[PDB]
Amino acid sequence: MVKVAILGASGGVGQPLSLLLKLSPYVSELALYDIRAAEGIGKDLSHINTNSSCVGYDKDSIENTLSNAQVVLIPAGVPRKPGLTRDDLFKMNAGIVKSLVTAVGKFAPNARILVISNPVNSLVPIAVETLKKMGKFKPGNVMGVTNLDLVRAETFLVDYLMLKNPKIGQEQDKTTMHRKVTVIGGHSGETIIPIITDKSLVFQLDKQYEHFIHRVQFGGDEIVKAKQGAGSATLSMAFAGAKFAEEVLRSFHNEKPETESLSAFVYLPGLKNGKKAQQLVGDNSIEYFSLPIVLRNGSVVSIDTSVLEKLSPREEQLVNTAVKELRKNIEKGKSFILD
Amino acid sequence: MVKVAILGASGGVGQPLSLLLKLSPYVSELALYDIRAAEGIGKDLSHINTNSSCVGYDKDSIENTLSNAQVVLIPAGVPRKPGLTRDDLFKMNAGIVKSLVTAVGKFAPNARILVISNPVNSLVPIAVETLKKMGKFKPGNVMGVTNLDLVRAETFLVDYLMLKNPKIGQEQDKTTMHRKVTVIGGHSGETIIPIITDKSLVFQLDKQYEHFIHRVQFGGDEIVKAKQGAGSATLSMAFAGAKFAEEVLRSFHNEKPETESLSAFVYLPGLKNGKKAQQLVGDNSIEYFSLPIVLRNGSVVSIDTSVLEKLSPREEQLVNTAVKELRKNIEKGKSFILD
């Protein structure tokens, strides 16, 4: 019997994520937590005719939320908004994550912890260092959820191909494009590295290729702009987070994944092929990257570095630009907590 | 293959309904409309890697939202604040539906209109009478979405069986309970008529049967109380809405519906076997009732009255009590248009 806990279940991402999870046939118990309104939402979702019992909990009941939880989804965090800077946004979400991840350490230390809160590049290290300090860190069980970059890469590959010549475009299926594209690096801007694995499609995009790459990298900013500062991508974040959790849940049930080269943002030095990945990205000491993972029983047991062993010269340049900015993001998270 | 428009896509039901609708493989084009925020929500959802083209529209562009739409979902309506009066909450939504159904008469008269706003018992007649004044009413194409009653009956039948007879409870699958229960009638309180079609489960339910009946009837109010007046069942309303929509869209192709005895709140005098239904519910002038329907190409081509012909004595009593109070609802909606 698998129990999923959602911490931040009442926010803009949290609510549609809770709905998508209630629909999963791999979940048998769904516990919803937040500082307000989760009981109500959980009661609303308990009426859906799927086989999972769903309960929400009040601000004071994070212990009941997390008890016997195998998977913990953390979408909690303050959204992008006009009068908020990225640094204050970061510092507030840093406090939310540390507090929530500390609760996981006390109440469900063996849970697979899926961090959805942004910025992923800086907040995952806050979660790891928090678990290290308590003596509760298992590298295979802490994943920064970067799956929305893949989603967008799948969507835009088709959109740019539909633009360049509808012939190959109208042949694509957006639902199956992960066989053709993989995304690695971090989860913001130029840290994001879209790798089209199907090299015929690169050629066919021709000069649309750099437009594609830029569009995947800046997809977050596009939605903020389209909601005039007053929101970011909530429904698609919920969707990507549910898709990624479904892959983790499939693995509990000894099924194979659906996504080819499914990536998450993980702690390299604690996993198999991690040091190999550090070399391949050109920084023997970089602690995190989003790379293709192999899951056993919900947990990352190795990193598949295949993608890094066949980079184009242009991709190698995306990597080296990404690694430079990513290092600063990692260092920013880790010093905020360690100092 | 088909364009779907959603009117009221930024509201509490509408945003989650729009996400679920983005996931449907039966949709070619998904158009979102609201007084505000639909552009942004549409742009968010356009990043999801499913094949539909998703565009949102501003308050002045309802015409481009509806152009060539074949199915139109109307979740629009006002969110109950903890103050709001029974009566005046109808009045506000009555005006919203009249306005939006008139836009449909003008800009997509052939479209299947799925009314999701509440109260459905009064809002569909409003919808129908509005379209009658314009001379655009096609009776196969106006449907009050009552599916959440079937969803809850499916859910609560399993929950009640589990609470008192775990052995048989645990052999139930909530996703497939529609083979074993049908809900008919109206869409509010004692107008809701749950008909357990599988007679063995009436026995298995034993002394819980009345509690089941009552839970289906008063499901909504359960959620309002759990939100302390500050909202309602938005997430399950969206689920049941996408689920009905998907049966509608399925109808355009060579596929049996998934749900057995799928019901919608429809205009009896305009549909094959409607007068029989009128006869069998024992009011030969009642104009509306939720009954199992047959969809061909998105439209009700006839009503299926079988469930009416095998009613138990208790279920006849529900039908009579539900008919009295449902006549009242229907008239309160006709009199907002006809006076």
Side-chain angles (χ1 to χ4, degrees):
Chain A
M1 97 99 72
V2 190
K3 171 174 184 180
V4 177
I6 307 176
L7 313 185
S10 312
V13 178
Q15 282 201 31
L17 189 59
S18 303
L19 170 58
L20 295 188
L21 263 291
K22 177 73 182 82
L23 310 192
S24 179
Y26 298 95
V27 172
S28 90
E29 293 179 13
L30 180 59
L32 312 182
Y33 177 89
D34 215 332
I35 59 177
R36 73 187 99 189
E39 290 173 273
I41 283 153
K43 209 72 226 281
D44 176 353
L45 294 173
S46 63
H47 294 191
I48 291 173
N49 65 317
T50 58
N51 298 298
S52 58
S53 78
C54 177
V55 187
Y57 298 87
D58 70 35
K59 67 187 202 301
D60 292 300
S61 309
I62 203 182
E63 184 168 20
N64 298 305
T65 301
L66 285 166
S67 153
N68 298 325
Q70 290 106 327
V71 177
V72 175
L73 299 181
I74 307 197
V78 195
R80 270 165 89 192
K81 64 183 158 176
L84 189 51
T85 68
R86 306 259 265 167
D87 276 3
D88 278 339
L89 185 152
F90 158 69
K91 289 170 178 192
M92 298 179 114
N93 294 351
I96 291 163
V97 167
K98 171 187 179 214
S99 167
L100 295 179
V101 163
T102 300
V104 178
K106 294 178 54 161
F107 307 127
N110 301 340
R112 326 297 179 275
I113 307 166
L114 276 48
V115 184
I116 293 164
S117 331
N118 287 310
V120 162
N121 300 349
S122 313
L123 298 178
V124 168
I126 279 161
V128 171
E129 295 300 330
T130 300
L131 300 164
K132 289 196 175 185
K133 143 267 219 180
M134 308 170 82
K136 310 286 185 184
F137 175 59
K138 313 192 189 304
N141 281 9
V142 182
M143 294 166 255
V145 181
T146 46
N147 197 44
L148 181 56
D149 301 327
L150 184 61
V151 175
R152 283 178 174 145
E154 292 179 78
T155 296
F156 303 150
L157 182 53
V158 171
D159 295 333
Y160 281 87
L161 290 164
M162 272 302 307
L163 202 66
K164 161 58 195 158
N165 57 344
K167 183 153 280 188
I168 196 139
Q170 294 167 231
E171 315 191 332
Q172 312 304 307
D173 177 350
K174 285 177 180 182
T175 55
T176 68
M177 291 302 290
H178 55 84
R179 309 184 202 293
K180 286 161 184 184
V181 70
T182 288
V183 187
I184 71 182
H187 193 41
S188 180
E190 287 195 271
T191 62
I192 297 178
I193 313 150
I195 307 291
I196 307 176
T197 49
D198 175 347
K199 305 294 170 194
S200 304
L201 297 188
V202 173
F203 186 92
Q204 287 156 122
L205 282 172
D206 198 344
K207 286 206 102 173
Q208 283 313 313
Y209 170 73
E210 291 302 337
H211 284 101
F212 171 72
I213 277 64
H214 181 86
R215 190 89 182 277
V216 179
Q217 293 173 323
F218 292 100
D221 284 358
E222 174 186 331
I223 303 308
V224 166
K225 167 153 194 170
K227 294 178 170 162
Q228 304 107 297
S232 32
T234 46
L235 303 170
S236 59
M237 264 182 272
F239 167 79
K243 266 271 190 280
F244 182 79
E246 200 80 327
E247 297 295 53
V248 171
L249 295 157
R250 282 191 181 96
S251 193
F252 265 96
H253 289 77
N254 194 48
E255 289 164 38
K256 50 182 73 175
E258 333 263 82
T259 307
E260 201 144 84
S261 315
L262 188 67
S263 296
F265 190 82
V266 291
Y267 176 72
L268 304 173
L271 299 170
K272 184 191 305 216
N273 309 327
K275 190 175 164 205
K276 167 170 219 193
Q278 290 165 319
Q279 292 169 8
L280 286 169
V281 301
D283 187 335
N284 309 290
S285 84
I286 192 168
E287 286 186 299
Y288 307 79
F289 225 68
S290 178
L291 287 171
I293 49 171
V294 168
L295 283 167
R296 182 148 28 66
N297 200 33
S299 279
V300 174
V301 293
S302 74
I303 295 145
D304 183 345
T305 63
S306 286
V307 64
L308 294 169
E309 289 153 32
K310 49 199 184 43
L311 301 177
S312 82
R314 179 64 180 115
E315 296 168 342
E316 297 184 359
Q317 180 183 54
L318 296 171
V319 167
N320 292 298
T321 301
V323 153
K324 257 134 79 70
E325 169 63 28
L326 183 51
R327 283 283 293 213
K328 287 153 189 180
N329 295 164
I330 292 161
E331 286 158 4
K332 187 226 275 153
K334 289 176 64 148
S335 70
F336 193 60
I337 190 146
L338 284 182
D339 299 3
Chain B
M1 200 158 297
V2 153
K3 176 171 171 182
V4 171
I6 302 182
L7 311 178
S10 307
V13 174
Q15 288 203 36
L17 174 69
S18 297
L19 168 61
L20 294 172
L21 262 285
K22 182 67 173 97
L23 307 191
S24 164
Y26 297 94
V27 179
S28 63
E29 278 181 302
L30 177 58
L32 311 187
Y33 174 86
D34 215 319
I35 52 113
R36 62 174 58 86
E39 295 154 288
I41 293 162
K43 272 296 253 177
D44 180 353
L45 289 173
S46 72
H47 299 187
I48 286 174
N49 64 309
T50 52
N51 291 301
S52 53
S53 159
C54 187
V55 176
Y57 289 98
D58 68 47
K59 79 206 208 304
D60 290 298
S61 307
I62 198 163
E63 166 160 24
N64 302 335
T65 307
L66 285 159
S67 191
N68 293 294
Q70 287 165 263
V71 176
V72 177
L73 316 189
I74 313 181
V78 164
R80 78 185 62 181
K81 61 199 206 263
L84 255 169
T85 157
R86 165 138 205 167
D87 192 53
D88 251 79
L89 200 125
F90 159 77
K91 268 184 182 64
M92 292 186 296
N93 295 352
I96 288 166
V97 181
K98 174 187 157 193
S99 164
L100 294 174
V101 171
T102 307
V104 180
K106 296 187 169 168
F107 303 129
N110 288 319
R112 318 302 176 284
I113 295 169
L114 272 53
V115 176
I116 289 164
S117 11
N118 281 330
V120 161
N121 299 355
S122 303
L123 293 185
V124 170
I126 279 174
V128 162
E129 287 299 334
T130 295
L131 286 158
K132 277 176 163 179
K133 304 243 185 218
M134 290 165 91
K136 299 291 194 165
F137 175 51
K138 317 211 168 207
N141 293 6
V142 182
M143 277 168 265
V145 182
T146 47
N147 204 57
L148 183 59
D149 298 318
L150 171 65
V151 164
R152 282 168 168 146
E154 289 176 274
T155 302
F156 302 149
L157 190 40
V158 174
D159 297 326
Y160 273 111
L161 288 175
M162 192 77 182
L163 183 50
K164 270 293 137 167
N165 197 228
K167 174 121 292 224
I168 273 160
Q170 151 253 148
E171 311 289 357
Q172 309 304 324
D173 181 354
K174 289 178 187 188
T175 68
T176 63
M177 289 311 255
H178 56 75
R179 294 153 184 180
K180 301 188 224 285
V181 59
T182 294
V183 190
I184 66 172
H187 190 61
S188 193
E190 304 198 51
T191 71
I192 292 159
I193 303 161
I195 300 308
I196 298 183
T197 63
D198 179 350
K199 230 78 187 132
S200 76
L201 305 166
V202 176
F203 156 64
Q204 226 74 42
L205 277 182
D206 190 356
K207 224 97 155 196
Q208 299 297 313
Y209 175 87
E210 288 301 320
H211 286 109
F212 171 72
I213 292 296
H214 176 80
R215 199 131 177 266
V216 178
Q217 295 184 327
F218 296 97
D221 262 289
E222 181 186 320
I223 300 309
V224 172
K225 292 182 185 186
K227 276 148 177 182
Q228 310 141 316
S232 59
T234 48
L235 296 176
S236 40
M237 276 181 62
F239 174 73
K243 278 297 194 188
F244 187 80
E246 196 85 327
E247 299 291 20
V248 167
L249 292 160
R250 182 162 286 132
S251 288
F252 290 72
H253 323 266
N254 184 30
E255 291 180 71
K256 13 56 185 43
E258 270 193 53
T259 318
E260 264 195 334
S261 298
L262 177 75
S263 302
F265 193 81
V266 302
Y267 184 75
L268 309 170
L271 301 175
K272 199 192 164 216
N273 319 319
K275 311 216 204 207
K276 199 201 296 156
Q278 269 178 315
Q279 278 200 35
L280 292 171
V281 293
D283 182 323
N284 306 260
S285 80
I286 193 157
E287 295 185 278
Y288 303 83
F289 219 73
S290 185
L291 286 175
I293 51 145
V294 183
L295 295 156
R296 180 150 64 70
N297 224 64
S299 312
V300 194
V301 281
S302 65
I303 289 127
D304 176 350
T305 48
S306 326
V307 68
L308 288 178
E309 279 153 315
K310 54 162 79 214
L311 290 172
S312 76
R314 192 53 194 96
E315 301 175 330
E316 262 195 277
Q317 184 184 336
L318 293 172
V319 172
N320 277 67
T321 311
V323 166
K324 295 177 210 203
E325 215 214 324
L326 176 62
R327 284 293 255 169
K328 285 193 162 51
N329 298 152
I330 293 162
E331 278 298 337
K332 182 210 263 189
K334 289 177 68 164
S335 81
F336 174 98
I337 292 307
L338 267 30
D339 304 342

